[PDB]
Design a protein around this ligand. Structure first.
Ligand SMILES: CCOC(=O)N1c2cc(CNC)ccc2[C@H](NC(=O)C(=O)Nc2ccc(Cl)c(F)c2)[C@H]1CNC(=N)N
Ligand SMILES: *[C@@H]1O[C@H](CO)[C@@H](O)[C@H](O)[C@H]1NC(C)=O
Ligand SMILES: *[C@@H]1O[C@H](CO)[C@@H](O)[C@H](O)[C@H]1NC(C)=O
Ligand SMILES: *[C@@H]1O[C@H](CO)[C@@H](O)[C@H](O)[C@H]1NC(C)=O
Ligand SMILES: *[C@@H]1O[C@H](CO)[C@@H](O)[C@H](O)[C@H]1NC(C)=O
Ligand SMILES: *[C@@H]1O[C@H](CO)[C@@H](O)[C@H](O)[C@H]1NC(C)=O
Ligand SMILES: *[C@@H]1O[C@H](CO)[C@@H](O)[C@H](O)[C@H]1NC(C)=O
Length: 335
């Protein structure tokens, strides 16, 4: 429909790079914005074909190119070389705002699966604050569904279509390279993982009725999608998830099958310098890791799954727009 603009809450004295970018590219946020219900209106949205996602994707690409410059960038046969300073890197929330003459409709149905008609609807200047968090397999630091877990998919029959599971309760994941310099690990409380895959299996079961629901670690691909990869404090972690996506939900009960220990699942992570870019088809080389404890304490707030009697779900990811979709699903720009 139109060109959106961003409102952030960053300040010009942070050397953190999301702050720097936002202070150049975004306008300050309205202290008290004002909504505008319309609980009879009913309009349709389709999260899977939402231009707001394109615009945000463009902006995050811009952000990363100005903030996480790689020492080397291989695209086609070209290699570009730049200074790759280590930087202060912690994502801040970004608001997307409709400019003069445009408004953002926001669907208020707390169970809205993200496509089709929605009943309660509001008008807003801006989205909520969205932390543009690049990762695969697990979505981190998002907003939780407020009712029940919600399964989103462009077409649940088409197994080639990424499924976004929207959790209603955070699950902590703590990743640390402590004080091999490239080796780290993550801790998830196996009990709350336990429960979470319980409930996720229930919801997947309503969509998949005759069948037993198996979680299995991702088959093949680049490391960035066969492991839970993400950026912590500038460094690209790649964490093994085969003790995480490893479980069976059969008789209305979930049985976890990956190996736990003293009540917590522990993922082996590598920090890596040679990255398969999400922005485009290419490779990006970075400097070896900073020193000391690198630690990220994050909320797993959704999953990205792919489906292959039994239905099997393995972790997925790689198309960063799905991350943005998970947060922008309940908004469209109109007028
Ligand atoms: C233009 C958008 O590209 C795409 O849709 N991709 C896509 C799509 C699919 C499946 N289809 C739905 C599978 C794999 C990919 C690739 N994803 C990454 O590479 C990717 O996520 N890396 C990474 C890097 C750093 C971090 Cl921290 C991170 F968390 C992730 C990408 C192509 N890029 C490439 N082959 N270099
Ligand atoms: C979250 O969703 C699950 C299943 O959809 C439900 O059992 C649970 O009560 C919901 N709310 C929570 C867990 O707070
Ligand atoms: C979402 O709901 C619409 C109708 O509201 C339905 O057509 C579609 O199958 C649902 N999709 C999922 C993934 O639940
Ligand atoms: C989803 O894709 C399937 C094929 O995988 C096909 O029957 C149809 O086009 C889609 N179904 C719906 C309900 O849109
Ligand atoms: C993850 O760990 C398992 C068991 O150690 C191993 O078999 C698997 O290949 C690993 N995957 C990756 C992508 O490192
Ligand atoms: C589940 O975990 C065990 C060890 O923790 C591993 O041997 C097994 O291969 C995993 N399941 C799958 C389907 O990979
Ligand atoms: C998630 O948010 C917490 C608190 O803001 C932060 O410490 C953590 O590093 C974030 N995780 C990622 C992957 O950015």
């Amino acid at each position: 429909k139109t060109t959106l603009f961003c409102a952030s809450d960053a300040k010009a004295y942070e050397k953190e790079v999301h702050n720097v970018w936002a202070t150049h590219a975004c306008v300050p946020t309205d202290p008290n914005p004002q909504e505008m219900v319309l609980a009879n209106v009913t309009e349709n949205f389709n999260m899977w074909k939402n231009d707001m996602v394109e615009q945000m994707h463009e902006d995050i690409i811009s952000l990363w190119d100005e903030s996480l410059k790689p020492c080397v960038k291989l695209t086609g046969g070209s290699a570009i070389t730049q200074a790759c300073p280590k930087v202060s890197f912690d994502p801040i929330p970004l608001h997307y705002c409709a400019p003069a003459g445009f408004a953002i409709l926001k669907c208020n149905n707390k169970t809205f699966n993200g496509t089709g008609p929605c009943r309660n609807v509001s008008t807003v200047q801006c989205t909520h604050g969205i932390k543009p968090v690049v990762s695969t397999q697990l979505l981190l630091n998002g907003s939780l569904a407020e009712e029940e877990i919600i399964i989103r998919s462009e077409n649940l029959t088409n197994n080639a279509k990424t499924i976004i599971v929207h959790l209603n309760e955070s699950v902590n994941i703590v990743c640390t390279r402590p004080n091999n310099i490239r080796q780290a690990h993550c801790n998830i409380n196996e009990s709350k993982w336990n429960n979470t895959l319980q409930k996720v299996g229930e919801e997947l079961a309503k969509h998949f009725p005759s069948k037993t629901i198996k979680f299995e670690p991702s088959s093949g691909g680049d490391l960035e999608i066969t492991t839970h990869s993400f950026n912590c404090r500038g460094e690209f972690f790649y964490c093994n998830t085969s003790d995480l996506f490893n479980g069976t939900y059969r008789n209305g009960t979930y049985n976890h099958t990956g190996r736990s220990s003293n009540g917590t699942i522990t993922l082996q992570c590598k920090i890596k310098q040679i990255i398969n870019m999400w922005q485009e088809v290419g490779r990006a080389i970075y400097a070896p890791p900073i020193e000391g404890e690198i630690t990220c304490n994050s909320n797993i707030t959704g999953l990205l799954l792919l489906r292959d009697d039994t239905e099997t779900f393995r972790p997925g990811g790689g198309d960063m727009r799905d991350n943005w979709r998970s947060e922008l699903y309940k908004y469209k720009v109109v007028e």
